[PDB]
Amino acid sequence: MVNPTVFFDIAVDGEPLGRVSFELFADKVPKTAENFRALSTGEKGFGYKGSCFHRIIPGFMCQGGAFTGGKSIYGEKFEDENFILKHTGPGILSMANAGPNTNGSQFFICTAKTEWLDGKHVVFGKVKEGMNIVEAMERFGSRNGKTSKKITIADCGQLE
Numbered sequence: 701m702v703n704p705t706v707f708f709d710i711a712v713d714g715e716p717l718g719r720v721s722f723e724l725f726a727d728k729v730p731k732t733a734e735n736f737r738a739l740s741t742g743e744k745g746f747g748y749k750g751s752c753f754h755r756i757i758p759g760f761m762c763q764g765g766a767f768t769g770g771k772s773i774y775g776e777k778f779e780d781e782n783f784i785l786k787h788t789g790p791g792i793l794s795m796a797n798a799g800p801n802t803n804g805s806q807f808f809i810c811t812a813k814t815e816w817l818d819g820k821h822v823v824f825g826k827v828k829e830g831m832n833i834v835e836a837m838e839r840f841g842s843r844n845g846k847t848s849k850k851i852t853i854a855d856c857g858q859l860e
């Protein structure tokens with residue numbers, strides 16, 4: 701089977717910035733890819749639509765996925781599936797966590813190589829189209845992650 705592709709339409713204080721799409725590496729991390737895919741379509745009855753990027757650190761990453769801390773599709777938190785894929789550069793999609801085996805819905809998009817996270821955060825996808833949109837988002841962050849405008853996922857879903 702072809703790896704899934706999903707998309708986010710990004711808005712800044714309600715004004716459209718464009719569409720970002722992601723390849724999900726289901727061939728290496730099937731359970732982790734399936735969680736993000738289903739949260740993007742809304743098929744379990746909840747997910748990423750309407751949520752914000754709450755933590756943005758320029759030169760590092762954009763983090764989102766906490767909706768009313770977030771939750772996985774497998775009921776609160778699931779195990780680290782593997783560490784096959786590494787944090788190799790801009791556009792890498794990886795799971796946020798609060799220690800071992802604490803994956804939920806929160807995720808981050810890298811804007812640099814973040815090798816110090818290897819073996820602790822599960823990498824599961826990469827930006828395919830719209831990397832410049834992620835770079836534009838990054839400009840609304842700060843040292844501590846606070847955003848100066850409301851950066852939201854206005855819409856989301858599956859393309860393949």
Ligand SMILES: CCOC(=O)CNC(=O)NCc1ccc(N)cc1
Nearest residue numbers: 769796797798802803804805806808
């Ligand atoms: C670049 C990645 O940096 C972090 O992951 C920092 N930790 C973090 O935000 N922890 C909060 C959190 C709570 C519950 C779940 N499920 C996931 C995350």
